[PDB]
Structures are given as C-alpha cells and as structure tokens.
Amino acid sequence: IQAVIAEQLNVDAAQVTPEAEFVKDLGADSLDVVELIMALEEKFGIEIPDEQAEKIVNVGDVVKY
C-alpha cells in the first residue's frame, strides 16, 4: 500500500508516511489522484466511490479502507 503510493507519484516510500497529504505534501495532480485511486483498486480488488474518495486527504484516510 506504500510501495504503491510511492511508485504512482515518483517519490520514495520514505516520504510516504500516515502524515503525508497527497496534494499538499506529495504534490499529486488531479490526474495523479485519479490514477492512484485506480491503482489501489487494482492491487487488492476493491471499489471506492467518489462519494467516499473526495474526502480522502492523507494516506491514513485510505489505509483504513
């Protein structure tokens, strides 16, 4: 779940900590967010509506999903 968030946004998993917010801290694009979400649905099969999505702000908010 962390080597995934790392590889999608060209960081190193080191910076990816429950603290880090995708936009403000990892610099995720609108495009980057769309692709990250779709890549977390692929890794372990699941589905995350844009209801629930929108108010996911940091990696902690999804790691409980």
Partner: protein, 151 residues
C-alpha cells in the same frame, strides 16, 4: 446496429476534419470491445508532410484513431445513440502507455482498430488493444480517456 457508418460516427464523436480518423464501426459490444477502421488513401493532406516521396501514416495518428474508437465505445456505452448530449461532450486523452509500432501503414491500407475495455469508471475509460492491417498487428497501445463537458 451491426455496422455503424460515418453519418452515425459524426453524430457521436465531436472530432471533425482533419482530425476525425475513424470511418466505420464493424463491431461494438457495450462496455467490452469495439472493432472499427479507417481507410488510408494518398489523397490525405497529412501525406504532403509525412513524408515527401514516402507516404507513411504517422504512428501517433494510429493511436489517435484507437482513442476515437474507444471514445465511440464509451459515448455509446454510457448514453446510447444520443446525438444531443454528444454535442455537449468532449474527449480528453489522459494517459498513453505500452505503444509499439511494428509495421508501417501506407496508402491503400485498411487500418483496423481492435480495442477492449480494460477498466471503466464513470467518465474514465481505460482501453487497450492493437491496430491491424490485413490480419497483421501494425501497432499496440493502451490508453485512458476522460469524457468531459464542452461548457
């Protein structure tokens, strides 16, 4: 239908000359796959420039035609054959991956687009497949497109 013709394509896709690069739909399975094609002829403006004395259909335009074919699958899977909403919508390339160019395409080829839905999610469509001439794969591509409001 069975086949869809240029008059139907024009009602669904917003693209116009010289960027409408699909001539006919030969197979269409909603949310699953589409087969379509574009005829390649010397009487196209692109061949003045690519290249003088050596007409070669540009690889990136093969990809564009795969994308328009996927967009036609996406429009009709979501909204059926609606000419009216089509006029308020736009297609936007998001990503392109795993592009291989294997064989040059030239005037006289029928360039066929074979695309299958890899994943779709509201207005986001991930398709992939091949482009083919005479049963041979001339290119491969995988892409994501968004249907967007023209506003």
């Amino acid at each position: 239908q069975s086949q869809f013709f240029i008059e139907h394509i024009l009602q669904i896709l917003p693209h116009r000359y010289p960027m409408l690069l699909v001539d006919r739909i030969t197979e269409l399975q909603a949310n699953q796959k589409i087969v379509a094609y574009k005829n390649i002829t010397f009487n196209e403006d692109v061949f003045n420039g690519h290249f003088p004395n050596k007409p070669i259909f540009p690889g990136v335009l093969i990809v564009e035609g795969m994308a328009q074919s996927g967009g036609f699958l996406a429009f009709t899977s979501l909204w059926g054959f609606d000419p009216e909403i089509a006029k308020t919508k736009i297609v936007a390339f998001m990503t392109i991956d795993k592009v291989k160019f294997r064989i040059p395409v030239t005037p006289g080829d029928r360039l066929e687009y074979h695309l299958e839905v890899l994943k779709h999610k509201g207005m986001i469509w991930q398709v992939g497949g091949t482009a083919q001439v005479d049963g041979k794969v001339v290119a491969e591509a995988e892409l994501k497109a968004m249907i967007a409001e023209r506003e």
